[PDB]
Amino acid sequence: GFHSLRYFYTAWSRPGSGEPRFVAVGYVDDTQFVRFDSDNASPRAEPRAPWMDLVEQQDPQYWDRNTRNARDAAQTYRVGLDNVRGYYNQSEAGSHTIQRMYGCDVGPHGRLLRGYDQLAYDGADYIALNEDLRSWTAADLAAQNTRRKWEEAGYAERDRAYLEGECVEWLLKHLENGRETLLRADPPKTHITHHPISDREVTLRCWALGFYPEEITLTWQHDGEDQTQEMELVETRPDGNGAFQKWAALVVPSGEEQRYTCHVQHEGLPQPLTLRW
Amino acid sequence: EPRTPKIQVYSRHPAENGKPNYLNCYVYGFHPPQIEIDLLKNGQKMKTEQSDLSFSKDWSFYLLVHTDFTPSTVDEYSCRVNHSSLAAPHMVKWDRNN
Amino acid sequence: DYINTNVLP
């Protein structure tokens, strides 16, 4: 199964809070390993995962080189805010946002499945690198200005050369260093809880805790019949320890609890689970 | 189009009074990035840490705000969020059953 | 690494 190295840039203006801010974070799969925050004095690229403590000795220039790259990005996208505002003729008293997401998916053979670079303005698609990694799709007339500038700059080929070369190499390097964290599939710990509401109704809540990676499926059934439409399913949420939690809950009539089952699929489970109260 | 945050408030481990635990406020699906998120103990702001700003495939942001806590039968916990998409702060009480 | 080249929009 594939792995992915992904980087996420946010530059935004915050009129009334001071100068624009830039935050750049990396992830391998669902685990964040690095951050850069322009609000720091002399901001540096900084490790956010324990296995990253080992890269200083393997790559003594890693932190200085990543600090330079992120500082350069911080300058580019914060100036970019003023550039794009000018394309739209937007006033500077408003808050605006540029986001960039780029990275690579690698398959089980160690080779690139796909690269991507996409940008958003005020939360909407703005410009994206096409799947051929030589050309750009521009969302509107303003983004066509950007597109022309990046075609003249030959930036797609610089993108392609990173996404196909360096991105893949580094994903492989991180998967090796962070093997114990990244290559785990930690199954959910599951249980059902029982919450009477009224005299004739009760809530059954099916819990999945401590699982990695994030992808999971929770379902309720009644007599083998899928309850998806009637259940309350919360969005998967981080537990703050590097894993995730989810639950699905259902209102059933008192006395009928034994008729319902919870079904859990997660890649760390040897087979899908069925739980009953 | 500003996007309103969704909020969940929950412990890392199932709550038991007197045992140290971790209180989380997970707020997500919001846009633009500037947001105020606080955990409150009996209506008073707690010292918390906040995760690095990231976002999902639809470009909406998510954040985790957290701190150590030891639940009780007495203490009430809540999460307070204010965001440019909101006209007033959003208060969400902690329910140890979620 | 973070990509080492960035271009102004």
TrEMBL record, chain A:
Keyword Signal: yes
GO molecular-function terms, A-Z: peptide antigen binding; signaling receptor binding
Biological process according to GO: antigen processing and presentation of endogenous peptide antigen via MHC class I via ER pathway, TAP-independent; antigen processing and presentation of endogenous peptide antigen via MHC class Ib; immune response; positive regulation of T cell mediated cytotoxicity
Keywords: Glycoprotein, Immunity, Membrane, MHC I, Signal, Transmembrane, Transmembrane helix
SS bonds (residue pairs): C104-C167, C206-C262
GO cellular component: external side of plasma membrane; extracellular space; lumenal side of endoplasmic reticulum membrane; MHC class I protein complex; phagocytic vesicle membrane
Membrane topology: Single-pass type I membrane protein
Localisation: Membrane
Domain of life: Eukaryota
Keyword Methyltransferase in annotation: no
Principal location class: membrane
Domain Ig-like: 188-276
Job description of the protein: Involved in the presentation of foreign antigens to the immune system.
Family listed: Belongs to the MHC class I family.
Name by which UniProt lists this protein: MHC class I antigen
Protein source organism: Pteropus alecto
Gene: Ptal-N
Residues of the full protein shown: 25 to 301 of 368
UniProtKB/TrEMBL annotation, chain B:
Naturally occurring in which organism (per UniProt): Pteropus alecto (Black flying fox)
Localization annotation: Secreted
Domain Ig-like: 5-85
Domain of life where this protein originates: Eukaryota
Residues of the full protein shown: 187 to 278 of 331
Taxonomic classification: Eukaryota, Metazoa, Chordata, Craniata, Vertebrata
Signal peptide: none
Family per similarity comment: Belongs to the beta-2-microglobulin family.
UniProt protein name: Beta-2-microglobulin
SS bond partners: C25-C79
